[PDB]
Write a protein that binds this ligand. Structure first.
Ligand SMILES: COc1cc(-c2cncc(-c3ccc(N4CCN(C(C)C)CC4)cc3)c2C)cc(F)c1C(N)=O
Length: 293
């Protein structure tokens, strides 16, 4: 951190800022946490510090730094110049191959989080709890990697131990599952948080698929529920739409003339069941995406 120069702020919010920095000439991503989001900084750090968390589709950790006297919190990761999937989707259309590469890579990263790996260099099961296109980064190889583990929760099957932590920050409201919005989520059940990830993943699938061209037709980039909720929607705005109206992102008619998008639409709906138990697992989504190729 003492040998890094901040060059440009690639992202800002009430959470903090992410900066492009140079570390010995190599570009790095620098997330500067507000003192209010100190819990998120530690959760991400301890996962990267202790857990064997390394995968092609998880944002690569480099270093974490903190000085409190007031308090500055730094998380330094690899820098992906193409930006978030959210940014990338506004600027490019896709074909079948690149669309599948994107969503299969996300599914591969989510499966690796959710799967408990026993052993020495193993890992507990991890649920993300804030999955969204802005938290997924596009690499130059055309694959994606998941970022921002600040809300993540861990589970070990052996001890049946669930580390959820107390974080004042809740997930992004636009992506909250119905059981979160109606507050019926089993808060001490690890399976509940995985199923929350699957819901958000279904929404990201919809965001990507709209940008896949079929028969000369493509939709514009839109966030989930763009047509029914305002920008920066409230908890109550989301709950009315998802739980009362029971709305879900609409499937454009042109998708049903393309076999890939028809299969993706089927996948989406199997992430969007009101019943969290009915939703597919991450590993099953990855296998289905693989068969689509
Ligand atoms: C440090 O930690 C994190 C780092 C990142 C992260 C990693 N590599 C690249 C970026 C990045 C994202 C977007 C853009 N764009 C520039 C151009 N565009 C404008 C012209 C409109 C849009 C924005 C550039 C770089 C980021 C943010 C992500 C994280 F989620 C974390 C986390 N929360 O841990």
């Amino acid at each position: 951190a003492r040998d890094i120069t901040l060059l440009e702020c690639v992202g800002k919010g009430r959470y903090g800022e992410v900066w492009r920095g140079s570390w010995q000439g190599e570009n790095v991503a620098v997330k500067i946490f507000s003192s209010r989001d100190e819990k998120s900084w530690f959760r991400e750090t301890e996962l990267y510090n202790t857990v064997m968390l390394r995968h092609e589709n998880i944002l690569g950790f480099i270093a974490s730094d903190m000085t409190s006297r007031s308090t500055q919190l730094w998380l330094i990761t690899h820098y992906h110049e193409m930006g978030s999937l959210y940014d990338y989707l506004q600027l490019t259309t896709l074909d079948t191959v690149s669309c599948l590469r994107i969503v299969l890579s996300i599914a591969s990263g989510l499966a690796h989080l959710h799967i408990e790996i026993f052993g020495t260099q193993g890992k507990p099961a991890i649920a993300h709890r804030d999955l969204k296109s802005k938290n997924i980064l596009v690499k130059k190889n055309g694959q994606c990697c998941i970022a921002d583990l600040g809300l993540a929760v861990m589970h070990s099957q052996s001890t049946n131990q669930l580390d959820v932590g107390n974080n004042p920050r809740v997930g992004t409201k636009r992506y909250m599952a119905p059981e979160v919005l109606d507050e019926t989520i089993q808060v001490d059940c690890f399976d509940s948080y995985k199923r929350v990830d699957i819901w958000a993943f279904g929404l990201v699938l919809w965001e990507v698929a709209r940008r896949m061209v079929s028969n000369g037709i493509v939709e514009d980039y839109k966030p989930p529920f763009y047509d029914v909720v305002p920008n920066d929607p409230s908890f109550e705005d989301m709950r009315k739409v998802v739980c009362v109206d029971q709305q879900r992102p609409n499937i454009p008619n042109r998708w049903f003339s393309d076999p890939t998008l028809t299969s993706l639409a089927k996948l989406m709906k199997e992430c969007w069941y009101q019943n969290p138990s009915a939703r597919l697992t991450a590993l099953r989504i990855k296998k289905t995406l693989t068969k689509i190729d």
